[PDB]
Amino acid sequence: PQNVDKILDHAPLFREPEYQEMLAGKAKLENMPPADKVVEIADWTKSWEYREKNFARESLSVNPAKACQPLGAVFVASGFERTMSFVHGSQGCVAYYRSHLSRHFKEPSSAVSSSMTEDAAVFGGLNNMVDGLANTYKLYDPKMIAVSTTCMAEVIGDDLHAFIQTAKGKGSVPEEFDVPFAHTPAFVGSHVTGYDNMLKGILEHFWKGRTPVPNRSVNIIPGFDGFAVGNNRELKRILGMMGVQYTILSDVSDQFDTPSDGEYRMYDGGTKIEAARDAVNADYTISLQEYCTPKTLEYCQSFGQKTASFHYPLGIGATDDLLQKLSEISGKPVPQELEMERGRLVDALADSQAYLHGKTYAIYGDPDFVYGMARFILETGGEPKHCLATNGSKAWEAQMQELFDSSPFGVGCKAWGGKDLWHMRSLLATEKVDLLIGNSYGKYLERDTDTPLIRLMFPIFDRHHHHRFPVWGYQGALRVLVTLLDKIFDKLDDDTIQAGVTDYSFDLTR
Amino acid sequence: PQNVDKILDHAPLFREPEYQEMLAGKAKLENMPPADKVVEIADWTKSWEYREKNFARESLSVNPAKACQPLGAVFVASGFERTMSFVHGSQGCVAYYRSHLSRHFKEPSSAVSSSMTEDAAVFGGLNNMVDGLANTYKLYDPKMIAVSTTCMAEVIGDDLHAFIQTAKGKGSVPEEFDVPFAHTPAFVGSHVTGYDNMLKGILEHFWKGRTPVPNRSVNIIPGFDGFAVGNNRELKRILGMMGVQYTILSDVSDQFDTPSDGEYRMYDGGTKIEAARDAVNADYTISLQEYCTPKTLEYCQSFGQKTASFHYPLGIGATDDLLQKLSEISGKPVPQELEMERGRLVDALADSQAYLHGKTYAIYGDPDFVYGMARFILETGGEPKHCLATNGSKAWEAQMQELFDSSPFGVGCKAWGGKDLWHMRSLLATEKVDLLIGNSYGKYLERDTDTPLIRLMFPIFDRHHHHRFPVWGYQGALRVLVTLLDKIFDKLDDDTIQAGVTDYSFDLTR
Amino acid sequence: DKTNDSAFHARLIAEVLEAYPDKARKRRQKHLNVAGQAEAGVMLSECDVKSNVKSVPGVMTIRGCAYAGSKGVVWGPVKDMVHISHGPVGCGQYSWSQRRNYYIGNTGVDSFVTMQFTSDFQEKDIVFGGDKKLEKIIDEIDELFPLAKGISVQSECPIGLIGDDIEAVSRKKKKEIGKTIVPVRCEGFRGVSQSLGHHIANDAIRDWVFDGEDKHAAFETTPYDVNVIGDYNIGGDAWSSRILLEEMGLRVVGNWSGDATLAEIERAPKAKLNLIHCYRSMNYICRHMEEKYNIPWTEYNFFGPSQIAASLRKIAALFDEKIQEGAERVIAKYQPLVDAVIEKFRPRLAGKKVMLYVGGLRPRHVVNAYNDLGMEIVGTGYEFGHNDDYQRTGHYVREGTLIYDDVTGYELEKFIEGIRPDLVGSGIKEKYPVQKMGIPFRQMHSWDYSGPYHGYDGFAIFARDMDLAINNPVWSMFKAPWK
Amino acid sequence: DKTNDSAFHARLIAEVLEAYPDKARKRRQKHLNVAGQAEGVMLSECDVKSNVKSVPGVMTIRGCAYAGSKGVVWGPVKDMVHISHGPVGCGQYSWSQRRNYYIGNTGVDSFVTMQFTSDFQEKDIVFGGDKKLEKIIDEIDELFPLAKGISVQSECPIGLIGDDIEAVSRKKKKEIGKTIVPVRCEGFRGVSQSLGHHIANDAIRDWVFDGEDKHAAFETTPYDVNVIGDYNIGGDAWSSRILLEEMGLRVVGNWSGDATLAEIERAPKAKLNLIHCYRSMNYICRHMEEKYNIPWTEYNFFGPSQIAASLRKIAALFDEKIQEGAERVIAKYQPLVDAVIEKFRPRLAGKKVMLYVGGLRPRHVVNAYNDLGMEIVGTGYEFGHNDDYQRTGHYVREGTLIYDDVTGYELEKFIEGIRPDLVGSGIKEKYPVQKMGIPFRQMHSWDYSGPYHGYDGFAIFARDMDLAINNPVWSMFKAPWK
């Protein structure tokens, strides 16, 4: 029953005897399979025989760990000063993109739709663009509107450039107002591809036809990052300590972390429009996530920039590599304060490495994340046994194999590009590992296979505020190390807490 | 059996069938109580009747949550530049103090003993002091040697000041070399008292007989703090942003977090000896932990300083109060960057407060910590039901009552000064609460009463590196908030993870 | 500080309309109004608001699409079917487990709700068509999810644009695998909102489930057999409703579609009466069942004790004295709980003002529960309500209430900023800006991960949640003490 | 780059001695040596001074008599309440830090991982603590009714203020009908943990054995042994017990890891005492030999060489049946031994180790290291006596650096100079060594691992040494730009 003195909501309420009885009564008429059949099929789904059939799938995807392009377009556009993402196409898409980002960040996410309906299949979406851009510009006072497309707009084949010019001709926005655009088809690639397409469209808008006035600065593209708030602040701190001259291209770290102080800020921070325009002048562009930027880096190279890409740098060696690259670009040494951070991180790893050596992992997410996380795991003496990225290519599989081969701890390990979390479930059920690193969807894998989850990849919907703290840098690596250790120590204590049975090992000091 | 392909250490090994059988055979001959008697007594120890007998103890302490004075003396002395703690008395004490600190910080802890033996009960410890100081000075090249006492040295009544002067007369140390001293009796107060006594002895050594040359700086004493490494760095960050002129008196934040880079640093960082000497000139001294400093603040007042004490400032309001006080001293406003941090913290609390409202807690530790943690809990809409400090006085109970009375969430809360963790166990068993906030010894309370532990108080022996991150400041408050939420969400997921039974509530988004 | 509420609301309407270009302004002006005094159940207010028409481009509507209304709302909760999100990967990723339509099941084994199944269209699928891929998918489901009793095909935008024939696939494969396959044309370009997805989805139940031989000829009927139609069991809401209906003496044959199985849906035409909670989403199939099977339908409301008691009495009056007595016994059983809830929370909430914005039902349906706690509604509106929803709203809201159809982000921000209610009840896209303004917010779709709110057990939770949002220490901390 | 090890060790000794003032230097010089060539078999010969006072101010690693009594001997006894009698510190720092494992329901039938204290305040020092102690005993009797006995572990102030805990113990034993053991292990007594051992052994004699037989009904067998001096660190005594029982012995009691008071009381009924830790419990074995005619024999269960030799040695004291049992046990575990060696010896052979531990392990573990191809190049004891140093010659080779009661300064310099591949010592030594870029494994707590005794323990030992040394962390010490 319910009680006002100790109110029972859903979780405990439905375990009350009257609900259990009711639900048992309902079950008698549901025509669901009998309990013994459920056990039989459940066990079978955990078998090698089921694994073989599951891995022979050719057409069905189940619990894929990837989103569609426009999510990445909204994300990247949101990192420019007073910029509204305008997704030309069907409005259900935008409701979804905004809700997905809000649930991860616990923050507002603003974007608009041109609200194309069925009549655009016959007539095209010109009036949606013209009227939409007029309404967005007037209502939301953006400095820039960044246009992307939903899958209906792609199939219909609307000419974005011509539509935008017609809008200007009709006075929707001022003639000089910035309306960069990109095609972002959901049926190619994933959200990382949309990030790349949208960013290229923004840069092309500002750079096309220009000759650089070369300078020695470096542009830095962070990529699609669930930890952008903490990570970009850490990045800035590092760059400041080194004295590097840079521009971050797409910074969402203020946008997705505004204060609650009585004012709602629709926009905050981001790459300045004039900085984006002046970024053509840099001699170097670096991407912190290869797979978020290949078309963008090719476009940078077309202005004679030298480019380098990283793979979501986590841990000692990846951070070392980034700092050495920054040092080479800038001609500035790594300063003593950063070397002290490095040495403190090494101290933590040496202190704690008995708990990390020989641990086995499954890791999934975006391709750069998986690589980066795997590399950090190898530095700990761990084994990144099952690595998986639904949006990872064969080229990425090859890069992963080269990483595995670089360490004696990589000997079991495999990278599964193009596989989904139903595939991962069969891996975890047949070749058990200690820990699973992923995103909130991984909680189902924890439930189904008893493999504990650590959330280090977008989206994180079932824990709050993790995105506020870094995972990059020496500081972020230390945060990640403590997150891993805490999960291990929590399990050790849980495994040894049963009085007179397992608590002989319930050590006070570990 | 053992298996070289998957080695079993103690925890899994003794669950193997051959060990279970062996241990069942051993039990037959141990003459331990039968299982039904164990159940009967265990249940009784969780009853109201037992609680009454337990709380009627007058003489026996069981699982107290306090240490003895010299631990605090070692701690505070370790925060001065190249300073060696020299504990006059019995050497077993020093092995213990050093081990206790090392297990918490995962770091070296250096201190020496005068190695008094039974001979000193008859003859006194003069030669131990003379020779000891000579040996410490020559071997370990300190800039300062800070003398405290063990309980035997207190009972014997050695005259420290005379012994030290004799040591100088014999050439153990140079005549001008700094050898501050304090009596630190284990049978008075606790470690917090030793911190106070030792710090007073250091300041008295440098200040006695001087006339100040008044300046507007503020001296800041952090107190005995398991989070000193992260906390002092945060404090410095805040002070820097505000532009306050200050001296921290005892800063262990480098000493207990040196790098692993091929060199062992016996000493690092700390309050400069000349800064300690010049600290007499400050107009203000503030203590961040009232109970670590009352004799020290009285001594500061004897040089005409104005003093203020805080109670381990955690959360929004306590941080606000500290900054307003720093602003009053310095005449500098709180800068915009700190106000942004505050507003981001308020955002996080408003985002998450459905998980915090109405949560009930038990909290123990040092008196200032308990107060500060309770205040932060009340700001979240939680109820600090069972607050306890083995080293908390009646005056502390009164301060806690005032805190409870300030909020509608404090109704029914109680503060138990002088009680121990066996008392706490009866509170948890009879008046159940959601969460327990304490130190590693609280893991036994988690085991015995099924109340999950959050570790936010010294010593933390069974998790690694938590001390490296702040709990003070707006940033530390955000860290504490996430720690609390992560514990709540982990439990919510654990309560809802059983397929087809409790997982109707295994929500993807929380 | 002093205002006339109806006039002030009319001013806010004028203020927001001035922000638009002329073309958009003329469209929006018909969707904003203030509730008028009603002509001398009972109508408390009268108004005319335009509804269920296209959204204006570029304005930041809150609306979703027909796929959300079909897959997300109607079909997705049906626990023992595999629902294929048919098209590219996005729709089924964003809608994976975000609607809290609770069920009892072993997910991945006998139930498939909290999962994404998709055809994951790539460019070759767009160019050559996806029917062959869909056929293969169906075979892979049949093999890897053998306990699934049926399959639905939830069309995303590209399906109808490229000319695929999912109905031909469904007919062919149903014969091969011997399980119901339901093709739904809920592509997001159809209609203007979630609403048309409801209707398409209801038609699909009519056309693909209610077709064919009776699979339940052995079912034993009683005089008290009902279906609960349009309760999606958010946080257990349907279960909290079901217990009351059973205590009163009814037998619930099926609840559509929260915690529903295909068998329960197939048996619906065997019941005596359809009890409809969500009128918007499932009135279509009720009208069908009335026409084809002579099953009458009646609307009820289980939000708060006023409505619950009136609903039980109304429903019971359709049966006999035994059920009527059951209703009275249920109401008496829960009166101590109701009184306890009111005594504890009404003093903490009375006189507070609330603005709502939700989809198709809750903008009116929750109002009396608020009123039972002494709270007043000063603004409400629907994403996708029709005229018949706005008309029913007049039974619940008072003259002077601001009314907003398909409200834009700009509008709703200004209205909230101007009114400064004590609480806003709306969705996830609305929550965080409102809290940043220092205004309490409770999610009126997901129940902010709480609930149930339906029924007597739900009322206690509802009260608790409204109180903890409004009466908590955070709001007092917004202003820094030095400002 | 090239050195003569013995001479280089001697030079390190000269270097550290130069650092001291003259007075301390003369004391320390007798405690530092290099093992010489030897004239069962002595590998080396060594004269080192030992078991004398520490020099003031030098940063000794030693503890006190209370650690040796409460921390070591008595504290593990699971069904007694051990009162840390005096101020709060001693029993706080020693609360659950020694991993003497046991099976029990703590707080209910077992009391090991707890602090019980009289928490002396100034009044107790001034007026005496005996009345407080009497009350404490009554409170324990009421609140911990399944405790079978109580010990009183004296901290420094007890003997200094003239309290009479023996009178309290006699009085309360008669009142509550449970054994009360007063131990005079105040930390001012002796020079180290060692005298605590001896005082604690004497208290077992005087207050447990010296009493009427409570086990007259015990049925004896010809194969009844006590294991003496195995404190079950990480389960070490359980991994030892299984082998002894597989060989055909019956373990009457294991002192004191996982021990109950009943097991200790029955010890004089056994046929033979098997002593692992000679240092801590040789006293009570010598007593039992004299008083009850029970012989005692030393054994070593670290590593397969010692385990096999030990099983054979022990079995030879019984009969052909037990001798056959020894062979059968050795054969049963040979495949495990071979597997451990094949996996880990290639990863570890040729590596050099320095040790520093308390009273036994500085010699006892050496052959386990040698079984993995590792060599010991320095060892020493905190509190070993001359007879430990003499036994060490059976295990270490000529040229090994030997340090008694080593100072922090000395041991730092020795490790920095030698740069061994691994150091095995305690918690106070671990972190500075790792900062130097030298692998370290705790040789007291087993770095929270174990067991290391027995065949099952050898696999864990090997694993742990390998993961410390062959780990990627060391390669990351030097920043790539330096």
Ligand code: ICS
């Ligand atoms: S079905 Fe409808 S938007 Fe009637 S599409 Fe929507 S679970 Fe809303 S106001 Mo989300 S017509 Fe249900 C609804 Fe109401 S998803 Fe839920 S809360 S009562």
Ligand code: ICS
């Ligand atoms: S009892 Fe002794 S110091 Fe023999 S006091 Fe000490 S658990 Fe050491 S070398 Mo800690 S004579 Fe045991 C010992 Fe050895 S505590 Fe342990 S490891 S085998």
Ligand code: CLF
């Ligand atoms: S040699 Fe003595 S018996 Fe040994 S450990 Fe030291 S007191 Fe105890 Fe000390 S730690 Fe504090 S100051 Fe006394 S209470 Fe205890």
Ligand SMILES: [Fe+3]
């Ligand atoms: Fe937020």
Ligand SMILES: [Fe+3]
């Ligand atoms: Fe460390």
